Amino acid sequence: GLYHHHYGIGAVDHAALGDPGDGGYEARLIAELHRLESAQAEFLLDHLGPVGPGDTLVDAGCGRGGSMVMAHQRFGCKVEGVTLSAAQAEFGNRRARELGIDDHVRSRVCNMLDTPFEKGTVAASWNNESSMYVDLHDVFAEHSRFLRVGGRYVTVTGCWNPRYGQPSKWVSQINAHFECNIHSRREYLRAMADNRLVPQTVVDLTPETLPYWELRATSSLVTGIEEAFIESYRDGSFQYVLIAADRV
Amino acid sequence: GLYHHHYGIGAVDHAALGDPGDGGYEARLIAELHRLESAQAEFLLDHLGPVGPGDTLVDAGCGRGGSMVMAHQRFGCKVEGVTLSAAQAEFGNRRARELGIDDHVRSRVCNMLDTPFEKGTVAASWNNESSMYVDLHDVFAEHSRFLRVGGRYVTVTGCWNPRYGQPSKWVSQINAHFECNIHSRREYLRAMADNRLVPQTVVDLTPETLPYWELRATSSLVTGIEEAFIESYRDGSFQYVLIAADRV
Amino acid sequence: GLYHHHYGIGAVDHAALGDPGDGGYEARLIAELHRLESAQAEFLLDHLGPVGPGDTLVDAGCGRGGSMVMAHQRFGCKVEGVTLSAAQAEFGNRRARELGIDDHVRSRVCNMLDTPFEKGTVAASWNNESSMYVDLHDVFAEHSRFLRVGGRYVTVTGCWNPRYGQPSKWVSQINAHFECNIHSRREYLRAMADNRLVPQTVVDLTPETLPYWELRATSSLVTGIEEAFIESYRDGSFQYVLIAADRV
Amino acid sequence: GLYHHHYGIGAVDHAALGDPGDGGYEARLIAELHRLESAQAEFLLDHLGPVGPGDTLVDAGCGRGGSMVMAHQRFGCKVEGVTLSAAQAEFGNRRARELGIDDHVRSRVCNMLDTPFEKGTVAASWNNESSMYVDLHDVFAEHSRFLRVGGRYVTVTGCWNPRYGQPSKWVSQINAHFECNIHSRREYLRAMADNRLVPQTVVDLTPETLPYWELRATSSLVTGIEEAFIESYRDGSFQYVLIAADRV
Amino acid sequence: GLYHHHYGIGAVDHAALGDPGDGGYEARLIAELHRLESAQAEFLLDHLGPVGPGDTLVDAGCGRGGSMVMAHQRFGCKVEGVTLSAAQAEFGNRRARELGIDDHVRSRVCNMLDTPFEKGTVAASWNNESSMYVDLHDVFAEHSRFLRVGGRYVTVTGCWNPRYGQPSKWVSQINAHFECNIHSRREYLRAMADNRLVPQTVVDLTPETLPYWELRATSSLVTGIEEAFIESYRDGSFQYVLIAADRV
Amino acid sequence: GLYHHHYGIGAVDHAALGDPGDGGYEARLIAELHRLESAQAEFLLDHLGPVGPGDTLVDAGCGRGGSMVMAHQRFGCKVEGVTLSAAQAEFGNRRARELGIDDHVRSRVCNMLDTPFEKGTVAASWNNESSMYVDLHDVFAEHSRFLRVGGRYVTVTGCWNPRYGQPSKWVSQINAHFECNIHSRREYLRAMADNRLVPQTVVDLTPETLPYWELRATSSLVTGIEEAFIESYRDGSFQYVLIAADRV
């Protein structure tokens, strides 16, 4: 993507898309994709509970910091980000300095499994499309450690549905495309329970993210993976969900 | 209650309530309470997935069969109910014979922990305000046993929120009132994971059930327990939730 | 209570109680209650094993320090107490200064779940009627941490008997009265096993504590809860037990 | 031993032992040993709760049926025994026919791990000095299966104390002597918790069984193993205990 | 493949391969591939222990029965096969009738997770390249059920190495190619331990199977997936192993 | 033994043993025993993976340092040893100073359960015939702690085979002889899985160690325990194995 690395949710604004014959259509599409992505990040924020200006938020696998900047403009709190990409950290910070908020928002190169945050000092943290890259038990044990008792964890992610048995080929094609390891909803809920994380909200967002991918499949920038997403989301083997949980 | 033994959800129809000075007000209130209760049972049904006419549904702790009759009029399937009360079974069946559907809907005196249903033959089952009377691990292990792989379990129940530590006095007052043992959301999610039940939807309904109890606290039939419900729901120590899960 | 916050054990000295017609009867009763309470605390001490003058003992949920002062006068060791009540800490310490033993015995405001004691430095610790206020797994994990390998843990507490299924209303009435969360004997034994605590002695003391509550139910100071205790102890749904365990 | 295969408890009757110079001393000793053994079996019975005439009791590893005959003469119930020795079964039954109670008491060759008793039909069962011959998790899972909910399990056995780390040589010498596999108190309590068996009474009987072994070490029939028992019981590495538990 | 559906092990016979210029080379290659495959199946048999003529062997995910026919010609026992493919069952049986051994060897359409074999009646069973298609805990729980105590389980399979963290893209490409779900060596060993299966032999066969795939990558029949196998086997993210275990 | 405290593997060199009539035979035997012992230690090293000069290796229960000196002469790395015997530590170090390598190899008196090594700093560690002296879960949890992610653990040890049920008398005789507590292969594999140790190689070495013990049973130095080893290794109740695992 251009800013947010995650996917979006919500009905597409076809009116603003205009004529696919215009030259500026492919541009008007990128703007739309962004709008839908911002909307889902805004939705993930709605689930962090009431974070105050004095709280410290953590974003595991923060990408370019889009979610961190949004968290700060909304809550006023301090936000620490973490990623494996140096280029991405530098980017997020550069953007913060420019916004005059690098005194609250910072990204750093660090593996989300071995973070520098002290036990029980984080008020809320999240994984926005990044838990598909790490063992679930270990990332949740880490969030649980640095999370304050009563803290809030949120994760928006794609997971294969165990209701239909083993992972469908679609899920595997996506895994191969991103060199990730998509987990099952069973594994998500299991790991959370074994790590003192208790779900407060579990919501399947597949219907809200479908328009996003259908619109994306009609572009130039298409990478060939949008087919896997659309089919798996339709036959139900793959699903987009949001899980907000309390660190009990 | 009068028919449904569970509680309701949704905004109160104050217009239909009219003048609390009318003699018929206390009557118009009972009708409203019923409407809200039917609405929540209708909501629990929305989470059973697509049950077909050939499926067999189970209601653990079925009360007077209100949820069973509703399930059948909606899906056309067979519905087996279970309770400890003989008077309640007789009632549910009597109502079925009268509706001319006792060839699909039946209630029987049987403990939900030791049911007669064969392994993997039930398509969907639920606990509507009755899981607060039994050990969670054992009732979920039982549902999991008679539930078909891919089947759907739903539970609407009051649970104390572990986010606020131990059970508040309010929760204990309710327990004493009904001689029940209200569980924690942690225990609900934990038991489900240890019994091959994977939550597909988790939604806090406390805001939707609050109007129900506030309206109830203003009646003659009041039992004195409505205070415990309203306060605990407000300070957040007690919460009303719906959990729909897949038997994986 | 007046000094010890716990309950007592042993046959009542009716001779010393004299005529319930005397004015001084209600006084002679308080003295008796105290005697029975001291006797049970003395009994809990009998289960700490051979603690030496150089050992450090811990009392989780120490109340007014009665058990701590008794532990020190008997063993000569150092005793650290912990409670949530500032007024109770101040009281215990004041009493220690007066006894000229505040150089061995001290109480402090601290939650028994997050104690300041170093790993493996405590020789023996106990919960005298206070484990009913906290999650069992967490308090036992904490005792296990600061407990020396080979150390001794003791707990005297009321627990609902799982032999009779769910908690009886009596247990719930008590919970509501003290805003506590009485656990099941199953939960006690389970938590101990998951936290390297191995029971050396398990003894039901309900028969020895019954006289205590029957005598108490005949006083002025009665709070109305003595009925719940007596009935539940009689029908067997509630039980008073002592569990001495080794930190293996 | 002569009848009971287990060990005994209680103070030795030195008066009845008389002069060790008599020829009949070695005989008077066997009679004493028996008395102490009967006394411990009587003690194990005290922990079966109130078994009625219509109950079915099970003895896993029943030896010659001494405990079964005693259970029946006391309760009037039906008692099924199980052992690997055909010669021992035949003996127990022969003794029953003679007592005119083989219509209640029966022994059979069957492994205690794979019993023929139906799920939930046994009221109480026990292992008197025989759990040291089988995996603990498997024998307790079996008792739990055929045990009625609310049933009572009792075991009197020698176990190495984990408070002193690994098994002492003494314990190993005994294991080699009987070709058994003495377990740790930790393993006993652990297995019970993982198999729905909740200890109601745990009592160290080592002091009550010591006189038994000291008297035994002074006989002709001595096998050389009494040294291992006496030393290990004294240094505390080995211990004799009774555990009565409820099948919850 | 042509007969065996699994992969092979052992040094390639380049001498028998002759000139890649011959027309008959592509034929001489298929014969070689077969030889290597037969050799690995022969190797899996070496790990079934001493199965006698009266034993019943099971092959979960049997393909065309090549391993079953080989097991019978070697041991003389009865061999039951299971697969999801009707065409494959018919094939295996047809081959048995022709060999005059269909009175010992039979294949049937049945899911390896829900088999018809009775508890404890199978002497040895195996998964030859088929465990990558099912949840590991469930297939091993099933083998454990129908496996006699002391029985032997063997599995030859490809598994991603957890020593290198998450699944490499190579593993994902293979998963997508076969629509399977390759597990981690950690998951293999974990599931076995949770299902009473104790490994007696664990051997990495990646070096012995490498020649097999290198020779295969030089053919006409190539499917494009041989690259994924060779690279992942070389960088160590994917590995071919054999695990022989006892049902304890 | 004389240097290595462990046992050996490999065919006996009868030619070098010469005439058992020579006076120097009993000497030529000790030399042979040593050769076989060095060979097995060399074999354990083959399973540490590619340890580099900058790695730190740990030997839990190091005896006289024979395995440590061998590890260093082969890899060039730093090797820390641990034992309970002061005399053994002094010996290992003395030998290191003499070899001019005490700047890489060191032994110290420390219990392998509570080591001073920092979390994740050790590249590979092992237990050569010493895990039979400690609880398995605790020693493996310790290795896992100080072991780097991706590190390698190896253990060569005698374990009773669970395939034959409970420990045979032979195993018990050995336990009594060394005052150790021989574990079951089940316990070895179980503990490893619960402590993030995943077996890469599991190999029964009983056939390779048998010649070692048969040759030993024909000497003067015989202690009487060689009978237990030979018989148990033959009837299969006891077994010598090597387990190499990765810290995942």
UniProtKB/Swiss-Prot annotation, chains A, B, C, D, E, F:
One of its GO terms (biological process) is terpene metabolic process. The chain holds residues 53 to 300 of 300 of the full protein. Transmembrane segments: none annotated. It comes from the Bacteria. Its cofactor is Mg(2+). Its EC number is 2.1.1.255. Belongs to the geranyl diphosphate 2-C-methyltransferase family. Keywords: Magnesium, Methyltransferase, Plasmid, S-adenosyl-L-methionine, Transferase. This is Geranyl diphosphate 2-C-methyltransferase. Coiled coil: none annotated. It comes from Streptomyces lasalocidi (Streptomyces lasaliensis). One of its GO terms (molecular function) is S-adenosylmethionine-dependent methyltransferase activity. It catalyses: (2E)-geranyl diphosphate + S-adenosyl-L-methionine = (E)-2-methylgeranyl diphosphate + S-adenosyl-L-homocysteine + H(+). Catalyzes the SAM-dependent methylation of geranyl diphosphate (GPP) to yield (E)-2-methylgeranyl diphosphate (2-MeGPP).
